[PDB]
Design a protein around this ligand. Structure first.
Ligand SMILES: C#Cc1nc(N)c2ncn([C@@H]3O[C@H](CF)[C@@H](O)[C@H]3O)c2n1
Ligand SMILES: C#Cc1nc(N)c2ncn([C@@H]3O[C@H](CF)[C@@H](O)[C@H]3O)c2n1
Ligand SMILES: C#Cc1nc(N)c2ncn([C@@H]3O[C@H](CF)[C@@H](O)[C@H]3O)c2n1
Lengths: 291, 291, 291
């Protein structure tokens, strides 16, 4: 019944992840370990951030998220363990997840544990937190941590203790908000009637394009479903389409759909074809939208 | 103890699959989720069909197969949930799976749930079915399904309710056989003493080549183990070898083996080397066999 | 609760692994199956060896390691099942794994089951073994094993019986040490006061380079942390750096770190950048080190 959702940059090609898992079952034999993904670009905390920010509403209360890319492994840094506040609504409309009207989740029901290197920046933004600790107790980490494997020693091990009900406040000292490292999230700029941001992700394996322009950004510029839009990527690739709910509304196979993705962000795709791959579109390219 | 075997086109590079899983453990905390694979070519229902058709005999009775590529996500379509009839025999001979003489499986012991887009075509062919329903009840799907994620909303969510014993007949109305979408399976043609079909799959990661020419097709043309065969791929590449049980019977490393694969289909490989990759062989190429 | 750690060359792109798993839950419904990895280069027993040799100390006592690349599938060969002796200390220093001072593991607490094709060579070297059997009983393998799938029939099936407490000595006859196939581990040679070995692995996804030159080989040539080293790969690519504990000690991003990896072997990397990929370094290349 206790659950650890595990996200790393360790890859799926050797025994790394399994060593972490072995230890997790050693510390908490009834735990269920769920892989989020292990394929993130190493050291890109922004990319890791995206894969973990939306998890809580999908998981049972009490779930621990162990989340790590650890470029500072072997240094004096220590992980941070955080009890978030609201599981938050999400998606294209703003709802709970699940059958019926969804499963609503109590506040303070989820713990993230991560290197204190910015990885939880967006988790804290969207969810807030109740308490936050530096993870230092030798009860939950090794007295002699492997210098090149803090992902295992400083995240995976202690997440299993946490999953086994080890008290969050005993992992180490409390952290003041400014001691929690953040990365800068680039804002979405207004520019005439236009909104300007970036391609935040390519949606693998489909090659859909996700922007950082949220539905809230769109509504506060007079834009809802059915609005005819111009969406320019990379300064040069304009596209035009009405904003629709889904891919199939584009009509013919191959046609352009502009839609709100399952996180509520402005997105673009081809109907039953890949948009991004044939045109080598990339995370980071500009993205401008207007009616 | 209940099991969901999960097959999607969602990939292994983001949080998509994990969101489904979180929900599965939310709806049925004692469930075991087994990944079939998440790597299929998006929207290729024929390829998905292959990965799910042979599962039932390997799994404990009561197992639910949640299987999805969902190109029609966000439209008015609804999934179908089916209780299959026979778990069937399979493999190069026709047997149950497991130690000893195998574990034989009761009829009606398995449920598939899938978009109604053809994905279960071969499942129904090989296994038959007892009952089939459109999945519509808000008890097992969301009242507001995420338009771009029906794989989660219309397959994963309800599969967990089913796995938790939710009655199959209450998911929605019964479906007449003709309401269950099918794809055309191309038949194997006789042509003089020859049989003509197609390369159905490349067997990754080994680069073995699988055809659609079944052992039954071979026995009804006088062909058994030890028969010297000519197998022509792509109209032009005409291999010759005796039909053998396995790869190592080819003699030297690199040599050609023609054999019956673990599903009973005519196949070709190199002994301890990849056949398909150096020669860019592909699913879809012709395949002709004769003695 | 019983655990099977599963390592194969079957890949993650079809139903192969799932068929094994289905059977594992069929034979032992309370088992937890942990994927080590399924991505190894087919038939490369040396590569598989690396992924399994360090597992035991991470896992709870009683864990069964089912480990397989099975190029001799369909032949008269039979798997070997081995109860290892010491779980052994490991890592850059030599320690148990886990929080505090680690979880020490009783002798004889782990079983490996594998083709008898050399795959356990290094497991036996580093761990020793108490008992070893040929796996032949039809109680734990099929009477008609699928010729092309001994990985399932001769490893996965019997590993589940073993996991369920089936007595190890009843799987088949005992094996004399010389009946257990080994591969030659190339030794590390001294040359002047240089040490000469090979690149044993590229550490995906990071592109770090691992050699077969152990810390013990280094201490017995007067080399400890802080020693300024020359490390020449491929006969031609020299590098120089002090031997440090971790990556971040290299100073600037992109700079060269020479370190001891989490298994205790001499390694080289770039700080927060990939070393191996831009320069197409490969498993097998020479590796020479000196002060
Ligand atoms: C600066 C740098 C740095 N450089 C590397 N070459 C490197 N390779 C692996 N790591 C980190 O080691 C962690 C394992 F704990 C992984 O999560 C990685 O982030 C690395 N960090
Ligand atoms: C027409 C089209 C269509 N077009 C796309 N660009 C696309 N991208 C993802 N999907 C489907 O969205 C489903 C998520 F449930 C996945 O199973 C995919 O098959 C898509 N469907
Ligand atoms: C010689 C040769 C040989 N040749 C092949 N073309 C081949 N394809 C798959 N296998 C083995 O089939 C096993 C499944 F049991 C896998 O683990 C592989 O090692 C193979 N072995």
């Amino acid at each position: 019944r206790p659950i650890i959702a595990f996200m790393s940059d360790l890859g799926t090609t050797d025994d790394s992840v399994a060593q972490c898992k072995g230890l997790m079952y050693s510390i908490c034999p009834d735990v269920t370990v769920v892989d989020v993904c292990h394929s993130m670009t190493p050291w890109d905390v922004e990319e890791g951030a995206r894969y973990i920010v939306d998890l809580p509403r999908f998981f049972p209360e009490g779930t621990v998220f162990a989340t790590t890319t650890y470029p500072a492994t072997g240094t004096t840094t220590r992980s941070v363990a955080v009890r978030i506040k609201q599981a938050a609504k999400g998606g294209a409309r703003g709802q709970w997840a699940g059958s019926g009207a969804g499963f609503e989740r109590a506040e303070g029901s989820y713990i993230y544990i991560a290197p204190n290197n910015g990885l939880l920046t967006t988790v804290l933004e969207e969810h807030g937190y109740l308490e936050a600790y530096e993870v230092t107790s030798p009860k939950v980490i090794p007295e002699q941590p492997e210098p090149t494997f803090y992902s295992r020693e400083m995240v995976a091990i202690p997440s299993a203790h946490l999953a086994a009900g080890f008290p969050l406040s005993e992992v180490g000292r409390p952290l003041e908000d400014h001691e929690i490292v953040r990365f800068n999230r680039p804002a979405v700029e207004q520019d005439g009637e236009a909104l300007v941001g970036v391609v935040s992700a390519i949606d693998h394996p489909f090659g859909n394009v996700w922007t950082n322009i949220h539905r809230t950004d769109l509504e506060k510029a007079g834009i809802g479903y059915g609005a005819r839009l111009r969406l320019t990527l990379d300064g040069v690739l304009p596209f035009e389409a009405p904003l629709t709910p889904t891919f199939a509304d584009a009509g013919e196979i191959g046609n352009i759909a502009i839609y709100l993705n399952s996180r509520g962000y402005l997105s673009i795709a081809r109907n039953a074809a890949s948009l991004a791959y044939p045109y080598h579109l990339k995370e980071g390219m500009s993205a401008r939208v207007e009616a």
